Amino acid sequence: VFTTPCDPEY
Amino acid sequence: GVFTTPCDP
Amino acid sequence: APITAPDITSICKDASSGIGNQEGAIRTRKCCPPSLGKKIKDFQFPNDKKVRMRWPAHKGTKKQVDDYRRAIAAMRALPDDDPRSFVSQAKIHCAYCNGGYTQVDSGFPDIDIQIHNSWLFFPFHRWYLYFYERILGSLIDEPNFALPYWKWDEPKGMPISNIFLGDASNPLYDQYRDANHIEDRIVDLDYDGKDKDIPDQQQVACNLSTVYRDLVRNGVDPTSFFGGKYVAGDSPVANGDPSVGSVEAGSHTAVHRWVGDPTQPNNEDMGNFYSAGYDPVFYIHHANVDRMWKLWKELRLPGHVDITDPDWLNASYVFYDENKDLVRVYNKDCVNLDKLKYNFIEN
Amino acid sequence: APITAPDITSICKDASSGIGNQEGAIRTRKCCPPSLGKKIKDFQFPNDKKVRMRWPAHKGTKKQVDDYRRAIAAMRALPDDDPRSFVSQAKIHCAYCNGGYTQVDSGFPDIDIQIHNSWLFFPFHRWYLYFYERILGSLIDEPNFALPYWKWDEPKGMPISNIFLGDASNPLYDQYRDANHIEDRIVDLDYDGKDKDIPDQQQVACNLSTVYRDLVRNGVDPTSFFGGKYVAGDSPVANGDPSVGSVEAGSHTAVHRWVGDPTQPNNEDMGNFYSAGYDPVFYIHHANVDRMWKLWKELRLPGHVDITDPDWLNASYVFYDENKDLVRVYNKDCVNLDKLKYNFIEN
Ligand SMILES: [Cu+2]
Ligand SMILES: [Cu+2]
Question: What domain of life is recorded for the organism (chain B) (predicted)?
Answer without folding.
Answer: Eukaryota
